[PDB]
Subunit: 175 residues, 6 copies
């Protein structure tokens, strides 16, 4: 089941990301059900916005928001909901939402899957446009959902991303 | 597995629907395999028709046709095969097919997923065009499949839909 | 050529809308070139947003922004860029952008194309969600384009939409 | 303009077909406007059906229904509305609709475009399933449009198709 | 789980194929993880090529390359990754890749799913174009992947395909 | 008509490209008809390959192959066939095909359309993967078309691209 996928081959530099939402998709927010391992519809988003990258999480981790830590994965073609991709973290958008601290990691496909992103070493190697679009998305996608909100602190480097991943792994390991 | 999804949070008004076929999709009829929980191809449909809504079933239920009761879910964007959506029943198209009584429930996304369908309270709130298109689809989609057929009795209200769901739940609970 | 399409059969209640951008499309802003009648790329939009309806204009009209008046057309399936649809106005979102007063009409498919929208008589018949999504789109889609901006005054009724169309027709007829 | 495309290189065996509707598309019926050469929306179809092949017409021809003769073109990938494909006729579905005699030609891509259909010499070389699906589509697609209807006479061979094309060409040449 | 799907109802003539990659899809190579049963991204392909048919494997089998035997399934519409289709083998493209002998079976949808391919009895009934396209794909898709390669021996008949399936089944049954 | 689009605002650094084939599209080769300005199907490609970028030409130019000079335009979303995009040349793949010298320019969206490609100044700024994929595509896409072929000389810089554009413009201006 997706429930049994490892957090990673070599945490925090070598991770697996379970994809819930494809890049450039309709505005349906899917979540994996920790009960059944099935993809559930969480929300039909009300704003005319789309996730700028594939979106998902690292299994066996937990954010302050109560769910596994979230990850954005850019790829040359959108991924399948429910699929898993081997990734390498390069940056993180620190932010909080109405359910807890809720960082958004950016992890690129592992060089074993492609050489395309090998040149993305750290957060400043990400295109400025993409980072701007990501931040803008989290700032506004819940603009029409009463009671939900976001506050974006800011972009941090790979070292912070990795620390995030270790902290998230531990918090699941005992909580 | 999809095999373990509940029939619902609060049967019959608060249900979960396992989706097998997306709205406005190619004419491939998928079914979930009660054995493995996998999506199997049941038929390549021969008519140039498409399911007018997302189509699937309520788990842990059974129709006279031998499979879980069937549900049509309108949504603003097509759902993923294999996904589960929380829904509220609003009407039912009574019909029989060559394998048994085979009602088609209509259930809308739960208000917790969206406010869009909250105004659809009962069967007369559904667009006339949509109901006509649904009935017309079940009447004709098997027109080129020898030995398969449909007889559409007619549209009934939410109260009947709900009764349908309770009867289907029981029939599975002991059969 | 698209250059020769009429403003309408019976202005302002019976209009033709030239579509430039389909509903639920990638974020490419196309414009028709008054020179050649060809569809030109105007902008690759930088925000992760999509036009909530098909978007285009009424030919032989002119807004204060210097181009034909703009129209949003909801339809059950996205339209082809470059196509023309017969429509009936039902409301208008008054707004200004950096290039002039820049109202966004909402016009539904003419009953001769479908009976689906015949029940949408005036602006309050439009779904609240859709109106909210439209306004939210115009407010934020240029958020990452320096020097471009929007100020949304508000939604007005069909009578205002129609007046808008007459004023736009005249301004082209002599300017 | 599309208005200026020839009927064909070598009528009736070597024709050009202007495509209005792609294969396996949403149920939007586009027509080219003889006025402007633009693609206009004619109808939002009400049944959950799709054209089984690309659909369009031969320019400079006229059917009894008042418009150019209609053609179905199977291809390995759907064509663009507005595009033109060189084709060879292989059969025809004789039928009448509420506006006049309204034969539906079947023409395959010319061998100069592909060798794929060279083996389709005449109507019996077309897959039985495809012919059945076509006939079934014309019989039922207008089932929910009051006042519109179809009566399918039957499938005839290439020789008849060709005769159809010659008669249609003449009727335009003087009417 | 997909892990539990049978090799087939009646090996080798009546098989089940687990689909990993749809026909005419983006160039993402998915593989099912024998650990978790999840679809993993194996590679982002570097060449501008696509699998000419749906692609997957027969469960409970093993090729010399170390994974279940591979199968190409033509269908009228692309299948869902993760789905299972009942198929009948009709031919096989013998080939070796850098990881072992790596035959590519061609199996058509079972007549119980459709009558469309019933006329494809053996390898010579497959379209020449399709066979050429398949061979050409395996010959070149790894052209930009250093260290990976293919050598195509050639097309063989259904009898060979079936033998392949039996040998693959045995090799898994004890290895 | 597309026939009337200019070669460019400021040749050779500021050009317009008429798009014939979208990025990541089905393998249908469209060409614009210099007669009618319509998009014609030139070929159904036989290999399982796709153009790695949007593909088209510069109007009012002519290559030795007898048609306007060809251009590849990378963009974040595929363009519409028939559309025109303002571009800036950055490199060129010199190559010959069976109809004459047949260079393939690479031009990126003009900074007025987006800031995304402003950092692509010259050919070495293009991703190595993309250049490899382009060359590989032209080398192999005609592999199954008897009598057609390609010989790729190699990648040259923006200065060469520009020279190419000037030479192509002149050759049309008097031939
Ligand atoms: Cl783990
Ligand atoms: Cl969030
Ligand atoms: Cl930012
Ligand atoms: Cl239950
Ligand atoms: Cl049924
Ligand atoms: Cl009805
Ligand atoms: Cl007018
Ligand atoms: Cl605007
Ligand atoms: Cl509003
Ligand atoms: Cl002619
Ligand atoms: Cl008709
Ligand atoms: Cl028939
Ligand atoms: Cl087995
Ligand atoms: Cl392989
Ligand atoms: Cl071959
Ligand atoms: Cl010029
Ligand atoms: Cl070429
Ligand atoms: Cl190269
Ligand atoms: Mn959540
Ligand atoms: Mn999450
Ligand atoms: Mn959150
Ligand atoms: Mn979260
Ligand atoms: Mn069934
Ligand atoms: Mn069912
Ligand atoms: Mn049934
Ligand atoms: Mn049933
Ligand atoms: Mn503008
Ligand atoms: Mn406009
Ligand atoms: Mn504006
Ligand atoms: Mn405007
Ligand atoms: Mn008509
Ligand atoms: Mn017609
Ligand atoms: Mn007709
Ligand atoms: Mn007709
Ligand atoms: Mn492998
Ligand atoms: Mn395999
Ligand atoms: Mn292999
Ligand atoms: Mn293999
Ligand atoms: Mn050419
Ligand atoms: Mn060209
Ligand atoms: Mn060429
Ligand atoms: Mn050329
Ligand atoms: Na909110
Ligand atoms: Na039947
Ligand atoms: Na701005
Ligand atoms: Na009718
Ligand atoms: Na290689
Ligand atoms: Na060749």
């Amino acid at each position: 089941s997706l429930l049994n996928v490892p957090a990673g081959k070599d945490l925090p530099e070598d991770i697996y990301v379970v994809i819930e939402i494809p890049a450039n998709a309709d505005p349906i927010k899917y979540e994996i059900d920790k009960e059944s391992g099935a993809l559930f519809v969480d929300r039909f988003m009300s704003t005319a916005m789309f996730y700028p990258c594939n979106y998902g999480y690292i299994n066996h981790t937990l954010s302050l928001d109560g769910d596994p830590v979230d990850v954005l994965v850019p790829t040359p073609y959108p991924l399948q909901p429910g699929s898993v991709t081997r990734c390498r973290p390069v940056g993180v958008l620190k932010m909080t939402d109405e359910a807890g601290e809720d960082a958004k990691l950016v992890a690129v496909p592992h060089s074993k899957l492609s050489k395309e992103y090998d040149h993305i070493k750290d957060v400043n190697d990400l295109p400025e446009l993409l980072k701007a679009q990501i931040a803008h998305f989290f700032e506004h996608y819940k603009d029409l959902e009463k009671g939900k909100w976001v506050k974006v602190e800011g972009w941090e480097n790979a070292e912070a991303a990795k620390a995030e991943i270790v902290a998230s792994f531990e918090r699941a390991k005992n909580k």
